[PDB]
From Swiss-Prot, chain A:
It comes from Bacillus phage SPbeta. The keyword Coiled coil does not apply. The record marks 49 as: Interaction with host DSR2. GO terms for biological process: symbiont-mediated suppression of host innate immune response. The keyword Phosphoprotein does not apply. Belongs to the DSR anti-defense 1 family. Signal peptide: none annotated. Counteracts the defense-associated sirtuin 2 (DSR2) defense system of the host. Inhibits the NADase activity of host DSR2 by competing with the tail tube protein that normally activates DSR2. Interacts with Bacillus subtilis DSR2 (via C-terminus) in a 2:4 ratio; this interaction leads to the absence of activation of the NADase defense activity of DSR2. Keywords: Host-virus interaction, Inhibition of host innate immune response by virus, Viral immunoevasion. This is DSR anti-defense 1.
Length: 116, 629, 320
């Protein structure tokens, strides 16, 4: 946990790890991660409430979430050091109490906005 | 060291105990009567001296200094990015060996490093004052270093490119084997080492250590700024007008970065100190814009933007900056619309083009120049450097000083139709590093027009069938741009049967108004969750609080999700269950609506105050300060 | 930054370094090396300034305080700056009896200097020996200075400077000393008014005091065609109810801000003013409801654009 970074603008953790997870439909995914984009100035519609948009990437290609994405992490693996970090992932997820506590990378779209 | 020559052009007696020849020269210059006293040879020598001193910006002594005008003016095609003119100059036949030195520099600046090395070798052959010979040796060593580093980087890096043939690499490795740049100056004729001592620093590994250490004066908190800026201009003019390739090296780029960043930070510090004391400085011009574009990375510009208020920095010579940006756009088009891609040139040029188009946010651009820049950015900027999201960010930055005209809206519409055409293929998927996709361009168009209907996308939609699914779920995110007929045709390809389809429709913008059947579906899901009690709950609560739902039969499910109970009825919520991190997930609209509720406002104000006092969190502080939630 | 919340280790070594600096200060200004002094005085000044965050023993604090008060040159550290340093030295060390005695010696020396009519204290930041006496009285309430009382009992009308200087230090004097001083000295000038309202001689402004304030305001008006902010503040806490104050707006911005908050032009407001006001004044400004939102905007701008954390403290504590 030496490259683990806590981003506090949106209370998440940037960690270079992959997740093997199972949803509520028994579907299995391997070597998947998440990328969060903090967009406070995004041009929202009437029904958008989140300040961040999250994209799930498995095997280097993103997923189109058509079903409910309620999922449980079965095995989290740190890429740099192949040591299993699943227990730390669940600990942080229980502590953080935010959607997708651990994220591969956080993109900040505030400073590059014309309204910044 | 007989005199100091200051960056403003004033001379000061420093260390000569003999005659004041500089003062006498200036006295001769000011008044013509004593000029006739000189001999004819002395008269023409004085004329040459006067031309040299006025060309180098040396006016008079400090004691006689008056209204001193210090305007930077670099006579270099390489500095101004006149790539077409540089190519024309290289195409021409070089009359002199000094034209060959300029040609070799221009070849280096255009990425043609093999030709530049060959020309420098030829100049070294034909050059034995011997000042071009020494400069050619310096620049050939520099270009050999550049070639070596580029070969290393290309071996390290998205497609394997071989710009330099291995025979050329071996030839220059053998030619420059055991070549000592340090021994170069000492091996020159003893007259050269006397007349051209000032050139010896060009053989050093580092030559900007002094200028960098004097940058600490900009970090003092107790003019230095003018001295630093004029010193930077002096270095730039010397390295570019004299066609020295070390101007492209990381040391010089880092020096320019450090000096400009510290100057802007210092100006910001003076502005804030004055505001603190006076209760209500750096004025950027064409040369500063070009320096930042050429030498700053995007991360460096982002550090500048977060550290200081660049919007409080007014920009001058905006017609010159617009010409620079239009030239950058034209070169982007030439490099990528055609097959003119030079990989060596591309590596150095793409960073400057990116930085220039990023910094163009602060520049007012004419409609035609904005059209050129926007078209080049949207269509001819390579996707390996600027993906769909990054290119959208760059484009949207251009609306800060130029509210979207009709021509730019048409260009973005052309881009959207091209993206839709790319979605004929089922395999094609947009790759974005920012999470921003083609939907964001249409969102921007509708933001700046509110009534724009794109005819070509409507035509594409009306031609759509059920087979090419990719086009339907692409154009669904672009629904506001379509016409009524196109909207009706598209809406037939999706169903809202179950609650998951409803969530998909809201997320992709399929439906923006909640019908009673959607409310019934939401209630069905809520009843199922309540029954199975012994992710969408917060979303439904937020929708009810945002007046997106007026069903009023939701209070049955209070007590399962804390956020849902908080949003459905703020008055009856117990705020020991409130999690402050919730406020970090809401956007501007939701936070503002929470602030204006007249309920739960004081509870969340106390929560934000506790978070600010306990943790000194900048996000919580700015949330509490902006919306006063 | 909050350097007071940063822990300081090896405090015995730091204290020994500070005591060595104090020893060298005493040595140089009791055989002065002018070349050494130029480089050494900056380091000694910064060390005694940064010593606020270091806990010092009674003996080491005594050495440092004595060197600072007596042997630190006035050319670098004026009496106000010296008071600032000494008061900063009380953050981690509540004033012991020995330090109180050292400051009393300093005050007695100041009076002995003031026996001459020509001598006058120079202070860039406006703090004088009366502030040393107030600092002494802050930590122990029932402190009577025997030596200054002795000088007071010997006072005559001829030594007017001594009379006024000891009037500024009235709380330190004994009952007989203050009785003799008040027999010799009476409040009849505006500076006398401020000194009396500071030391505690007067609690409520008599009509004569308000008449003196009005007279000074007529003088300021006729000269116009820094006691201004004090008068504006005094009228703002409703302690001055003469109600003629409003005839005198336009000289300086702080008076206008305090007397007529609705009519003040807040583009001419200075944020640093908020750093000078005390707890009660800041609370009154917050509750005035006439300038509250304007100074909220000023405080928010200062929080956004300045690194001074005092503005955030003010905004959070009082919501001014």
């Amino acid at each position: 946990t030496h490259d683990l970074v806590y981003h506090s603008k949106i209370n998440t953790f940037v960690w270079d790890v992959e997740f093997d997870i199972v949803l509520s439909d028994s579907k299995e995914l391997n070597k998947c991660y998440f990328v969060k984009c903090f967009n406070p100035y995004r041009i929202n519609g009437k029904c958008d409430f989140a300040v961040s948009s999250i994209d799930i990437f498995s095997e280097g290609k993103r997923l189109l979430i058509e079903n409910e994405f309620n999922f449980k992490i079965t095995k989290a693996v740190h890429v740099a050091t192949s040591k299993d970090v699943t227990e730390i992932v669940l600990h942080l997820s229980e502590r953080i109490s935010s959607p997708f506590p651990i994220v591969k990378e956080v993109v900040y779209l505030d400073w590059s906005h014309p309204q910044f | 060291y007989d005199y100091h020559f200051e960056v403003n052009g004033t001379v000061v007696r420093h260390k000569n105990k003999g005659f004041g020849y500089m003062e006498r020269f200036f006295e001769l210059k000011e008044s013509c009567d004593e000029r006739s006293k000189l001999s004819k040879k002395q008269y023409e020598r004085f004329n040459a001296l006067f031309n040299f001193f006025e060309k180098n910006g040396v006016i008079c002594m400090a004691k006689d200094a008056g209204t001193l005008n210090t305007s930077i003016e670099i006579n270099s095609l390489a500095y101004h990015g006149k790539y077409d003119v540089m190519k024309k100059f290289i195409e021409e036949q070089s009359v002199s060996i000094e034209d060959d030195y300029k040609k070799a520099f221009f070849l280096a600046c255009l990425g043609r490093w093999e030709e530049s090395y060959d020309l420098y070798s030829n100049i070294i052959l034909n050059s034995i004052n011997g000042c071009v010979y020494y400069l050619s040796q310096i620049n050939r060593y520099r270009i050999y270093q550049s070639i070596t580093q580029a070969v290393t980087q290309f071996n390290g890096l998205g497609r394997h490119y071989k710009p330099f043939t291995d025979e050329f690499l071996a030839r220059i490795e053998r030619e420059m084997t055991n070549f000592n740049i340090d021994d170069l100056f000492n091996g020159m004729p003893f007259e050269f080492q006397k007349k051209y001592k000032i050139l010896e620093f060009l053989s050093d590994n580092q030559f900007l250590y002094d200028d960098t250490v004097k940058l600490f004066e900009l970090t003092n908190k107790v003019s230095s700024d003018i001295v630093v800026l004029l010193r930077l201009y002096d270095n730039l003019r010397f390295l570019y007008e004299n066609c020295l390739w070390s101007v492209s090296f990381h040391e010089f780029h880092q020096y320019i970065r450090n000096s400009m960043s510290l100057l802007i930070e210092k100006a910001e510090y003076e502005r804030t100190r004055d505001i603190d004391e006076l209760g209500f400085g750096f004025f950027m011009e064409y040369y500063d814009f070009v320096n930042i574009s050429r030498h700053f990375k995007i991360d460096d510009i982002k550090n500048l933007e977060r550290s200081c208020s660049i919007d409080k920095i007014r920009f001058g010579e905006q017609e010159k900056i617009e010409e620079y940006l239009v030239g950058i756009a034209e070169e982007i088009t030439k490099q990528f619309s055609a097959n003119g891609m030079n990989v060596v040139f591309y590596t150095q040029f793409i960073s400057e083009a990116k930085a220039a188009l990023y910094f163009a946010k602060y520049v007012k651009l004419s409609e035609e120049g904005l059209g050129k820049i926007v078209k080049a950015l949207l269509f001819y900027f390579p996707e390996r450097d600027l993906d769909i999201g990054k290119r959208y960010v760059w484009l949207e930055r251009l609306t800060k000083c130029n509210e979207l005209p009709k021509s730019i809206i048409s260009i973005i519409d052309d881009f959207l139709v091209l993206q839709a055409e790319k979605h004929i293929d089922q395999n094609y998927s947009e790759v974005s590093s920012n999470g921003l996709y083609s939907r964001d361009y249409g969102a921007l168009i509708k933001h700046f027009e509110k009534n724009f209907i794109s005819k070509r996308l409507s035509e594409i939609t009306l031609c759509l069938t059920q087979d090419k699914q990719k086009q339907i779920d692409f154009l669904f995110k672009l629904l506001p741009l379509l016409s009524t007929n196109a909207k009706s045709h598209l809406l037939s390809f999706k169903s809202v049967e179950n609650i998951n389809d409803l969530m998909n429709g809201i997320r992709i913008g399929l439906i923006d108004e909640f019908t009673p059947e959607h409310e019934e579906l939401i209630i069905e899901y809520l009843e199922t969750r309540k029954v199975n009690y012994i992710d969408y709950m917060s979303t439904f609560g937020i929708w009810y609080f945002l007046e997106e739902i007026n069903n009023s039969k939701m209070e049955e499910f209070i007590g399962m999700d804390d956020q849902y109970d908080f949003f459905v009825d703020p008055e009856n919520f117990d705020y020991k269950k409130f999690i402050p991190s919730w406020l970090k997930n809401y956007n501007d609209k939701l936070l503002g609506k929470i602030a204006g509720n007249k309920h739960m406002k004081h509870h969340v104000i106390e929560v934000l105050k506790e978070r600010v006092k306990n943790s000194n969190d900048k996000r919580y502080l700015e949330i509490l300060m902006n919306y006063f939630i």
